[PDB]
Amino acid sequence: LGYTGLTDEQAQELHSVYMSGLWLFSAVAIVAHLAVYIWRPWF
Amino acid sequence: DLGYTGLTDEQAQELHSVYMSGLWLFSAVAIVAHLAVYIWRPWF
Amino acid sequence: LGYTGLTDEQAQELHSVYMSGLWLFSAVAIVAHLAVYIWRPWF
Amino acid sequence: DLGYTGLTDEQAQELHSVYMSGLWLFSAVAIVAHLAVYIWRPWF
Amino acid sequence: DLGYTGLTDEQAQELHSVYMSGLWLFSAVAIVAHLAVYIWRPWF
Amino acid sequence: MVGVTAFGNFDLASLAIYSFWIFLAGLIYYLQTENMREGYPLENEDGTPAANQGPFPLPKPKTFILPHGRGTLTVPGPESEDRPIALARTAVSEGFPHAPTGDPMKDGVGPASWVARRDLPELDGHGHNKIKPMKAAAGFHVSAGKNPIGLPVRGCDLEIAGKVVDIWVDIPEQMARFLEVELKDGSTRLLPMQMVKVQSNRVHVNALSSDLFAGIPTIKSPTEVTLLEEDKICGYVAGGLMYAAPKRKSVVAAMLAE
Amino acid sequence: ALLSFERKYRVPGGTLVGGNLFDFWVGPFYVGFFGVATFFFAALGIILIAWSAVLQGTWNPQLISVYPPALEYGLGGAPLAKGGLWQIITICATGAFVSWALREVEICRKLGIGYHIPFAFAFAILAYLTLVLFRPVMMGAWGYAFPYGIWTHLDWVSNTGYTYGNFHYNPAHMIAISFFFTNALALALHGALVLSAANPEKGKEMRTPDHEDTFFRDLVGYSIGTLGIHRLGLLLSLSAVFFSALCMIITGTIWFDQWVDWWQWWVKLPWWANIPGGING
Amino acid sequence: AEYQNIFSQVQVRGPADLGMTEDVNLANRSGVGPFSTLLGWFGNAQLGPIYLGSLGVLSLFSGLMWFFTIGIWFWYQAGWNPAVFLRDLFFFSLEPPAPEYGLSFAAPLKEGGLWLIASFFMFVAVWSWWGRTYLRAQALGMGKHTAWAFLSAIWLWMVLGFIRPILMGSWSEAVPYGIFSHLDWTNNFSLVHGNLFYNPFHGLSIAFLYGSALLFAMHGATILAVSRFGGERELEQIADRGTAAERAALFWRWTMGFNATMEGIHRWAIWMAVLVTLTGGIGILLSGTVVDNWYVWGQNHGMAPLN
Amino acid sequence: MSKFYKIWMIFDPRRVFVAQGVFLFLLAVMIHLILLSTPSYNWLEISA
Amino acid sequence: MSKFYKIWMIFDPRRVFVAQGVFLFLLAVMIHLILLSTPSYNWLEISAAKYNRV
Amino acid sequence: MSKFYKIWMIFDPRRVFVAQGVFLFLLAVMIHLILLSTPSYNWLEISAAKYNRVA
Amino acid sequence: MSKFYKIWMIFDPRRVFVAQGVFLFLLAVMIHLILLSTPSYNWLEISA
Amino acid sequence: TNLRLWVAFQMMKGAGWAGGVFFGTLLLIGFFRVVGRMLPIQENQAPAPNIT
Amino acid sequence: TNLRLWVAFQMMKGAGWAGGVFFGTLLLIGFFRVVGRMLPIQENQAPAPNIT
Ligand code: BCL
Ligand SMILES: COC(C)(C)C/C=C/C(C)=C/C=C/C(C)=C/C=C/C(C)=C/C=C/C=C(C)/C=C/C=C(\C)CC/C=C(\C)CCC=C(C)C
Ligand SMILES: COC(C)(C)C/C=C/C(C)=C/C=C/C(C)=C/C=C/C(C)=C/C=C/C=C(C)/C=C/C=C(\C)CC/C=C(\C)CCC=C(C)C
Ligand SMILES: COC(C)(C)C/C=C/C(C)=C/C=C/C(C)=C/C=C/C(C)=C/C=C/C=C(C)/C=C/C=C(\C)CC/C=C(\C)CCC=C(C)C
Ligand SMILES: COC(C)(C)C/C=C/C(C)=C/C=C/C(C)=C/C=C/C(C)=C/C=C/C=C(C)/C=C/C=C(\C)CC/C=C(\C)CCC=C(C)C
Ligand SMILES: COC(C)(C)C/C=C/C(C)=C/C=C/C(C)=C/C=C/C(C)=C/C=C/C=C(C)/C=C/C=C(\C)CC/C=C(\C)CCC=C(C)C
Ligand SMILES: COC(C)(C)C/C=C/C(C)=C/C=C/C(C)=C/C=C/C(C)=C/C=C\C=C(C)\C=C\C=C(/C)CC/C=C(\C)CCC=C(C)C
Ligand SMILES: [Fe+2]
């Protein structure tokens, strides 16, 4: 199924870059939560 | 090599390198601006 | 890369003239901000 | 030499000198008017 | 056919029709303004 | 259920108002996608698909079965101009006007543009030609207003370029569509009724000048006009508003003249 | 960013001001001289609304209210915190609206279409200028205009409406309400009819304009026609706005008492003002 | 100062169009009426024919009896005086029963009992007419868009007179049959329910009622602007996109960034008007049954400055 | 600032001058009205 | 930073200067109106109270 | 995070830069107005009380 | 009055139009000042 | 063909159009001011529609 | 080349020159009015030089 038209190899490369963006975004967020939880824990 | 915009990989790399330099310059001014505010009036 | 049709040199000349205008505009702003800060500081 | 308006470089220089001369004349009269009002009613 | 200004008879007729049209338009607006004031403040 | 709140201030009225925002958001999405069955996908100023297509995806295609056995029309579908566009790029950067390479009124570009419609006359519900001349129309006659037939045709340059001969009538709607203006060369052109102003004694065509009347595209058959011929005629006359501004003697035209 | 057919219509000319100075497209939008004024007045108006929220001390978008100057200031300037901002926004709103209409005029000339759309929009602007400019000036106070709030400009409507009792009895209002109801009735009928003729029962052919006239002739015995209904749509909307502008410009300027009191003239006609029986006497 | 196509500058009068005959029983269809020159300036001049079937008859009989019953009560309120009848025509009213009777049919004939009879006739009249719109579309093989566009109107009409009174358990909540009375009923409705302006659904209906005027002014002007290209023939533009459809598309694309089609604009048209009454029915239905004061409801939902 | 003349090869001169005339007049109108708005600097009032 | 001239290889100068001209004048008008609104930095008000213009 | 340059193969540089310019300005304007609303961090009000401009 | 057009063969048209513009403006100024001179018809005073 | 006059003429052209539009707007505002003064607004005038 | 505009342009040309001269004269009168107000004339001012 090729609705988008890109190949699986292009899909793999896009996914690898996309997850790198996701893990970078998540990593900042985890550090962001750690600082806030230390400053003002919500539990 | 999806090439939706028609840029080649070399063009993308050069465009990104200039774009990141602009971003780091923008971030650098912001970090100084936040230091000035935090020194003058910390919010933590 | 070409979008606006300007050559590399034409962009460099265009940017240099533009930057000259930017610093001239910035200089008046810095003079204006000093004048206001002296007259009435906001810090 | 972008030529978006078709004017040669010489015509641009001549027109700009005309425009700047009027700008400084307009600036000078405005300065006099601001001096007159500040004498009449200062705003600082 | 005195020709003091050099305009032909046809040009005089065309110009006069233009001038009269503006005159009646100017007259009409003045009449409206006079009606408005006389309603607001009659002078008789 | 007066004042009955499930939680906080949220109640049955609050339930309904939020549920409508969801419905309205969904409805606006549905309406917008339907509007995307024509003119899409987007294209660059050269003719290639653009990198940007919009936040709303294209809808699933639907098929219109045309009347009178004209075929079917499935949209969204591959749409082509099917005519050479005589325009020249005025700037490499996009979002800038394209200037005509030659005479724009003859080249069918800008306000004088036209579309390659089907080169067939438009039919009524009974299969007959919708637009026919009043002479060939059965029983049709002028019922009210000034009859334009026989009146001189004055262009935007205040010069008479012919007289009206016949009126073309939309047979179902029973309203006039075209004026058949005979020129000085013996040929008759068609003028849309929307672009003429039948005055007391003359037909004033503000769109076209006297010299441009001869340039109106002609019809292949005197008894009927196809959709393609309508577009060329309607495009040409309406293109005259901007492309005959130098030839117009109006005061406002002079003020807005370049 | 161009439609499959947009290219052949993108040609210079038709501009009212600026020539080719601003004759370019930003994405799908055409800029023009008046679009630059449009964007500036739009952006400036929006920011001052946001800044007015700061001064008011609230951030809830529904509670944001740019009140006009109080009645004591009359038709003069006011402090920005207590009415002055509203005057600047109203000037920005007036500038944005008229620039938008004139920008549409440039697009009309570039496409060679009629100026019905900007003329239709100008009716809305004069309706807008009636409430914020024409009515307050006659009444001699900016405070009679309405605040720029989502739910506070409804308070203005309710308060102004109840100043004159039940506002329904405004005769110009009754005309405009009948037009607004008629226009929505026409739009639902017109929209539904074309869709019914264009999206018929499955398998059946797309219908023709004759079926549209046949349907409404079988329904109510009269079809106004494809040209007529769009003429009707334009005139119904403009008449509704024209009478709505009229209804307010006479309220508080020519009529001051309850609008129900106005209707007693018909009851007090000379030939039946004194006949016993009925509702009135 | 040119021809704006607002009024036809010439009229042509051919033979009367008898209309299509897909599945319409021509026996139930009447003959062609007169040709109105006054109507011809704006639209078509021909009046008729009109189809009259079973639901057409039921619609007319109930519609006439509804109209007749209001008229007889209007005469009784006038004392059978034609002069009084014309003097107090707008001030006449067929009021619903008193609040004491609730939903009971025990109201005296002159104290609300007659209104129940007149309301029944209107109820049958309108519902029979809705089926008539449905069946006329089905007969010609068209879509049921009118039938469901009408059902939006019925929803508000049902709510005001039938559904909301049942929930409130009183016929006194319904609408009186009169010109000024149903205006007074409207005003009294808001005042009792605490400034109906702060009804969220009433605000939405005004949005779509304003929008319907906005969209029809936009749409009507657009087609008249592109009528010089034969844009008024919208069905052919849907079938075969001419230059009018493209210019109409481009005008709004260059004006407000987005546009529609010749067929998709009418989807906006139908939904813009349908939501007028659709949101209206919910807005009235909630009032009293769920919210006894909208301004207090507005305060607790961050729509009013207090609380 | 020795190459600011080149801006006239970017923007057409006559178009800018008309637009600048509009801008300068409206700006002059803008400032004068603000001065009249303030109770002071209102020359039409303090004179009387 | 020395490669920032390439922004003109992407953006046409005509549209940018129009966009920039609007942006700066919009920004300048924005700040002046903010200062005027506040009781402090309303230089028209400051002089009036300083020089007893009331 | 090394192949992020390929975002320009997906996104048109012209549209993003306009979108980013609008985004950054509106984001910056939003944050400044948020600070001005609060009595603290409204530097305009802060300096007035610090140097006693109220009188 | 069917031959009043011939006055444009006596007096040059453009010269007269400029002079007439001066005359009309000054006459308009003349009348307005006289109205302001009278205690009534002085719109700048009766309003306040 | 004087360049100084040509530039000044263009700027005066724009200033005149802005002047006419602004003066025309004041004319409408003044007209409604006059009509409101003529009508008996001050004798009986409505209270404030919105909280000051 | 529009005759109606050409005639109106000439009359506007004359009206503008008369307008500038009249506005310039008012500027001088206003200037001396301002200077006299600034100077302490009202505090001590001379009696009438001529019999009223
Ligand atoms: C003081 C008065 C109150 C108020 C009280 C109400 C009340 C009460 C109601 C409305 C309703 C409406 N109000 Mg409100 N409203 C006020 C202020 C406003 C203002 C304003 C600027 O101030 C506006 C624009 C509106 C606007 C509107 C409409 C959006 C809405 C009605 C839609 C419609 O078409 O109904 C009219 C159409 C119908 C009722 C449908 C009729 C359909 C049937 C099928 C027709 C049958 C025909 C019959 C057989 C006759 C045939 C005759 C023959 C053909 C000859 N209101 C104030 C706050 N308003 C209604 C609503 O829905 O609110 C949510 C409503 O019930
Ligand atoms: C009211 O409720 C509250 C708000 C209180 C609580 C909230 C509840 C909810 C509903 C929370 C929901 C949370 C969710 C759904 C979070 C999801 C987060 C995700 C999935 C985030 C994803 C982030 C990913 C990022 C930022 C990725 C970035 C990618 C890049 C920078 C690289 C892009 C470039 C590429 C791919 C190059 C293309 C490659 C080729 C080969 C061409
Ligand atoms: C309401 O919530 C509050 C406001 C309280 C809290 C806010 C929360 C949120 C949601 C905050 C969000 C923050 C975000 C998303 C910040 C993101 C910032 C970013 C990513 C900024 C980007 C900056 C980049 C810049 C300035 C780049 C500049 C680049 C240049 C000037 C050079 C351009 C030239 C090029 C690329 C040359 C082209 C090359 C060739 C070869 C032609
Ligand atoms: C909430 O609001 C407040 C105010 C409280 C807070 C707001 C904060 C924010 C969002 C502030 C925003 C600040 C920013 C982003 C300001 C931007 C400043 C910049 C970048 C200004 C740029 C100025 C540049 C100028 C004036 C350039 C002038 C150039 C010329 C005059 C020469 C042009 C001519 C050329 C290039 C000719 C070349 C042609 C050839 C053929 C070579
Ligand atoms: C928020 O608003 C308030 C009022 C609170 C504060 C406002 C703030 C802002 C944002 C102010 C904005 C200021 C700006 C952007 C000012 C810009 C001024 C400029 C650059 C003006 C340029 C003027 C140039 C002129 C007038 C050039 C004229 C040239 C000629 C006429 C050609 C030369 C010919 C001559 C001299 C001969 C003329 C002929 C005769 C017969 C006299
Ligand atoms: C002692 O003074 C007091 C005040 C007490 C009493 C005064 C008494 C006296 C002596 C009064 C004297 C009155 C006189 C002599 C009045 C004379 C009036 C006349 C004959 C005026 C003629 C006006 C003619 C005009 C304005 C003609 C205009 C023509 C055109 C502009 C050309 C046509 C073009 C048109 C209409 C298009 C214009 C273009 C646009 C865009 C609007
Ligand atoms: C001389 O004139 C003659 C006598 C010849 C004829 C003239 C007649 C006249 C003057 C008629 C006037 C009619 C008027 C003024 C009609 C006005 C109607 C208005 C303004 C109505 C407005 C709203 C009405 C609504 C919303 C009604 C809704 C009704 C329903 C939803 C039906 C409810 C159904 C019920 C109660 C069924 C109850 C019965 C049973 C058996 C369960
Ligand atoms: Fe339509």
PDB file of N, CA and C in Angstrom, chain F residues 148 150-153 160-165 180-184:
ATOM      1  N   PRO F 148     -33.995  46.387 -27.901  1.00  0.00           N
ATOM      2  CA  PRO F 148     -32.684  46.832 -28.386  1.00  0.00           C
ATOM      3  C   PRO F 148     -32.454  46.599 -29.867  1.00  0.00           C
ATOM      4  N   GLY F 150     -32.244  47.034 -33.639  1.00  0.00           N
ATOM      5  CA  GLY F 150     -32.205  48.214 -34.466  1.00  0.00           C
ATOM      6  C   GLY F 150     -31.476  49.392 -33.861  1.00  0.00           C
ATOM      7  N   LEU F 151     -31.155  49.343 -32.572  1.00  0.00           N
ATOM      8  CA  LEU F 151     -30.468  50.451 -31.939  1.00  0.00           C
ATOM      9  C   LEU F 151     -29.000  50.478 -32.358  1.00  0.00           C
ATOM     10  N   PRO F 152     -28.419  51.666 -32.507  1.00  0.00           N
ATOM     11  CA  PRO F 152     -26.982  51.749 -32.782  1.00  0.00           C
ATOM     12  C   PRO F 152     -26.168  51.266 -31.594  1.00  0.00           C
ATOM     13  N   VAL F 153     -25.017  50.674 -31.891  1.00  0.00           N
ATOM     14  CA  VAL F 153     -24.128  50.120 -30.878  1.00  0.00           C
ATOM     15  C   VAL F 153     -22.943  51.063 -30.732  1.00  0.00           C
ATOM     16  N   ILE F 160     -20.084  54.832 -32.824  1.00  0.00           N
ATOM     17  CA  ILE F 160     -21.000  53.771 -33.217  1.00  0.00           C
ATOM     18  C   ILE F 160     -20.272  52.779 -34.112  1.00  0.00           C
ATOM     19  N   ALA F 161     -20.381  51.492 -33.778  1.00  0.00           N
ATOM     20  CA  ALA F 161     -19.686  50.438 -34.506  1.00  0.00           C
ATOM     21  C   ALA F 161     -20.644  49.412 -35.095  1.00  0.00           C
ATOM     22  N   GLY F 162     -21.929  49.713 -35.129  1.00  0.00           N
ATOM     23  CA  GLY F 162     -22.900  48.803 -35.690  1.00  0.00           C
ATOM     24  C   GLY F 162     -24.254  49.003 -35.042  1.00  0.00           C
ATOM     25  N   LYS F 163     -25.132  48.032 -35.278  1.00  0.00           N
ATOM     26  CA  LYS F 163     -26.481  48.063 -34.738  1.00  0.00           C
ATOM     27  C   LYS F 163     -26.891  46.651 -34.359  1.00  0.00           C
ATOM     28  N   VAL F 164     -27.831  46.552 -33.421  1.00  0.00           N
ATOM     29  CA  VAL F 164     -28.334  45.252 -33.004  1.00  0.00           C
ATOM     30  C   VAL F 164     -29.251  44.695 -34.083  1.00  0.00           C
ATOM     31  N   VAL F 165     -29.142  43.391 -34.327  1.00  0.00           N
ATOM     32  CA  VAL F 165     -29.947  42.698 -35.324  1.00  0.00           C
ATOM     33  C   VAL F 165     -30.873  41.674 -34.682  1.00  0.00           C
ATOM     34  N   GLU F 180     -27.006  40.144 -30.881  1.00  0.00           N
ATOM     35  CA  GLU F 180     -26.308  39.861 -32.132  1.00  0.00           C
ATOM     36  C   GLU F 180     -26.095  41.182 -32.854  1.00  0.00           C
ATOM     37  N   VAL F 181     -24.906  41.750 -32.693  1.00  0.00           N
ATOM     38  CA  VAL F 181     -24.587  43.067 -33.227  1.00  0.00           C
ATOM     39  C   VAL F 181     -23.927  42.897 -34.587  1.00  0.00           C
ATOM     40  N   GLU F 182     -24.535  43.481 -35.612  1.00  0.00           N
ATOM     41  CA  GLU F 182     -23.987  43.461 -36.960  1.00  0.00           C
ATOM     42  C   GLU F 182     -23.000  44.606 -37.121  1.00  0.00           C
ATOM     43  N   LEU F 183     -21.796  44.290 -37.576  1.00  0.00           N
ATOM     44  CA  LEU F 183     -20.755  45.295 -37.704  1.00  0.00           C
ATOM     45  C   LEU F 183     -20.835  45.950 -39.083  1.00  0.00           C
ATOM     46  N   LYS F 184     -19.867  46.812 -39.388  1.00  0.00           N
ATOM     47  CA  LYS F 184     -19.831  47.491 -40.673  1.00  0.00           C
ATOM     48  C   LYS F 184     -19.365  46.588 -41.808  1.00  0.00           C
TER      49      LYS F 184
END
